[PDB]
Amino acid sequence: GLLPRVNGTPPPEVPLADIELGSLEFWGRDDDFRDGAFATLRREAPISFWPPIELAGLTAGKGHWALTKHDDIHFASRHPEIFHSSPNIVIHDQTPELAEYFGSMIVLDDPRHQRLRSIVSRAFTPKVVARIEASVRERAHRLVAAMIENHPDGQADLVSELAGPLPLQIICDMMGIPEEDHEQIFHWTNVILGFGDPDLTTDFDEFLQVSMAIGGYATALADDRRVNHHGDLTTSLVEAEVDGERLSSSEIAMFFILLVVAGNETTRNAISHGMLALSRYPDERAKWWSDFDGLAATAVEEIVRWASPVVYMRRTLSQDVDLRGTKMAAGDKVTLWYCSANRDEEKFADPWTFDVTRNPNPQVGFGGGGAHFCLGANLARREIRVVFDELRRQMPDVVATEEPARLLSQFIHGIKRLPVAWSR
């Protein structure tokens, strides 16, 4: 069952000597240990250097400076000329020749970044956006209704039945991907997302083959829309133009590959962590369920602060930096620990309280601001609002019944399984 926890309980005090950000065992510990570790770093070692996680037998790469304070993360995000996103935003890129293939605009600095982001942004036309909005509601409604039809027992895993499929179905709908191709897209996406996680033991050759197959699918989808225009994002991406520059089909494919990761597992984990928090703190569910539209904006923003689905993003210094008196050298890696910034005692009153009315809420779960600020933030907020709306309408007493099975990850605050139950 759910471990009892009172809303507002701080994490345990974790001694500095017990914190090993380069240790896989550390990332396997519960959230209360992790949160207490970052609280210790914020108080005692707010900028500190760490080795990467080393998987024995594979190259590890160089270490990184951990920024744990909201102010430092915000500063780094606002200075992309010093804190570069190229070559990649993870601590150690396992496939650096494919950094742009999987990363699209997220691994680019200006001027390349602004050009690609500007063209992609222009493709989100009013008609495309209106279809996306209808899709969010339709998909969330259908998935919750199917959970009821498929489980007369009133019990299901929220991840497989709802939080997992919703964000990827929305991405498929916006790309104009036929219903008949969903199973293939889901399979390829799952293999890609599953590679950095052990269990099932994900084979690199299979990972490379599926990565090329989904890329080839997307290039062919884009080429089809060059000939046959439709009212989807794929067609608007082929037609968009900034300063005479348009996107090639392989640029569109790389942006699609970014989406099925960045727009997908993040939202999934915001949903699962939101359902978990609403189950642990039933007063907050009651408040939201009593004034759903009125509290939606603050409730969703609190779910994102609480979940921080993206644990960190990595930058690389283009020049020496001295901040908080800590000297970091050009070429060093720097990590922005949003999970920590979203608990910074200097910015949030009562940071350990999950409060669906929280205002202000300067949360940085979509990043600290600036050039790379999540392109889909308002879409993510809509997905979260709409899915909880559909749960409230169709199964208002739905509740998590067990502690989640946690993903072992430094980068994603992941829930692999979340049992829930509901009545009429």
Q: Could you list the residues known to form a binding site, using ranges.
A: 113, 117, 315, 372, 374
CB of 202 to ligand FOF, least distance (A): 11
Select 11 or 263, whichever has its Cβ closest to ligand HEM: 263
Site for ligand HEM in 85-114 (CB under 6 A): 105-106
Tokens encoding 97 = 């020749």
User: Does 373 sit near ligand HEM (CB under 6 A)?
Assistant: yes
The residue from 88, 169, 266, 342 that contacts ligand HEM (CB under 6 A) is: 266
CB of 90 to ligand FOF, least distance (A): 5
User: Does 164 sit near ligand HEM (CB under 6 A)?
Assistant: no
User: Does 249 sit near ligand HEM (CB under 6 A)?
Assistant: no
Could you say which of ligand FOF, ligand HEM, none residue 365 binds, taking C-beta under 5 to 8 angstroms by partner kind?
ligand HEM
User: Does 365 sit near ligand HEM (CB under 6 A)?
Assistant: yes
Could you say which of ligand HEM, ligand FOF, none residue 52 binds, taking C-beta under 5 to 8 angstroms by partner kind?
none
The residue from 259, 296, 341, 387 that contacts ligand HEM (CB under 6 A) is: 259
| Cβ pair 402, 136 in contact under 8 A | no
Stretch that binds ligand HEM, among 52-60, 211-219, 263-271, 344-352 (CB under 6 A): 263-271
Stretch that binds ligand HEM, among 21-29, 236-244, 318-326, 365-373 (CB under 6 A): 365-373
- Burial-class residue 168 by CB neighbours within 10 Å (0-12, 13-18, 19+): buried
CB of 225 to ligand FOF, least distance (A): 25
The residue from 310, 341, 412, 415 that contacts ligand HEM (CB under 6 A) is: 310
Residue 74 to residues 44, 158, 297, 347, 368, Cα–Cα distance (Å) = 20, 33, 22, 12, 5
Binding annotation for heme b: 113, 117, 315, 372, 374
Q: Under rule CB under 6 A, how many of the chain's residues touch ligand HEM? A: 27
CB of 120 to ligand HEM, least distance (A): 7
User: Does 177 sit near ligand HEM (CB under 6 A)?
Assistant: no
User: Does 270 sit near ligand HEM (CB under 6 A)?
Assistant: yes
CB of 266 to ligand FOF, least distance (A): 5
CB of 102 to ligand FOF, least distance (A): 4
- Within 8 A by CB and 6+ apart from 405, the residues are 415, 416, 417, 418
The residue from 70, 225, 333, 372 that contacts ligand HEM (CB under 6 A) is: 372
User: Does 367 sit near ligand HEM (CB under 6 A)?
Assistant: yes
The residue from 258, 277, 300, 321 that contacts ligand HEM (CB under 6 A) is: 258
Could you say which of ligand FOF, ligand HEM, none residue 116 binds, taking C-beta under 5 to 8 angstroms by partner kind?
none
Backbone angles phi, psi at 246, to 5 degrees: -120, 170
User: Does 375 sit near ligand HEM (CB under 6 A)?
Assistant: yes
Q: Which residue has the tokens 């008609």?
A: 127
Binding site for ligand FOF (CB under 6 A): 88, 90, 93-95, 102-103, 106, 261-262, 266, 310
Tokens encoding 17 = 């000597």
Residues in the site for ligand HEM, rule: CB under 6 A? 77, 105-106, 117, 171, 258-259, 262-263, 266-267, 270, 304, 309-310, 313, 365-368, 372-376, 379-380
